[PDB]
Amino acid sequence: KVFGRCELAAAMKRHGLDNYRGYSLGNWVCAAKFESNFNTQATNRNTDGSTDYGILQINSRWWCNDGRTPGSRNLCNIPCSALLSSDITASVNCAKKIVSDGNGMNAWVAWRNRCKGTDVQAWIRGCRL
């Protein structure tokens, strides 16, 4: 599913991400934009053989099981395919664990490089929330 900007903001807010661990909704929408262009089915292979899945490009190195990432963990306790669903519940619950793990949203390199310190509120401007 390819979400609309405000549509995703609303779903994320509903699932409890607005200000989760201090990160305003705009941060999450910005991260999603640059990780996946709001596409739940997005995947990308990493140089180390791991793969990133879904709207927030969660990595099979630590967070989900795809059966093809040697020596990896599955800390969110989910198949990586669950992260491609039109229903973002699995991606959100897993993101909550990631953002809580010490480095906040810096876990998402695209957030650090493209959203961090910017006017992220612009990402939810005009949205009925």
Ligand SMILES: [Cl-]
């Ligand atoms: Cl899609």
Ligand SMILES: [Cl-]
């Ligand atoms: Cl957009």
Ligand SMILES: [Cl-]
């Ligand atoms: Cl915001």
Ligand SMILES: [Cl-]
């Ligand atoms: Cl894909």
Ligand SMILES: [Cl-]
């Ligand atoms: Cl993989």
Ligand SMILES: [Cl-]
């Ligand atoms: Cl594996």
Ligand SMILES: [Cl-]
């Ligand atoms: Cl594990």
Ligand SMILES: [Cl-]
């Ligand atoms: Cl599995």
Ligand SMILES: [Cl-]
């Ligand atoms: Cl933080």
Ligand code: NA
């Ligand atoms: Na894994």
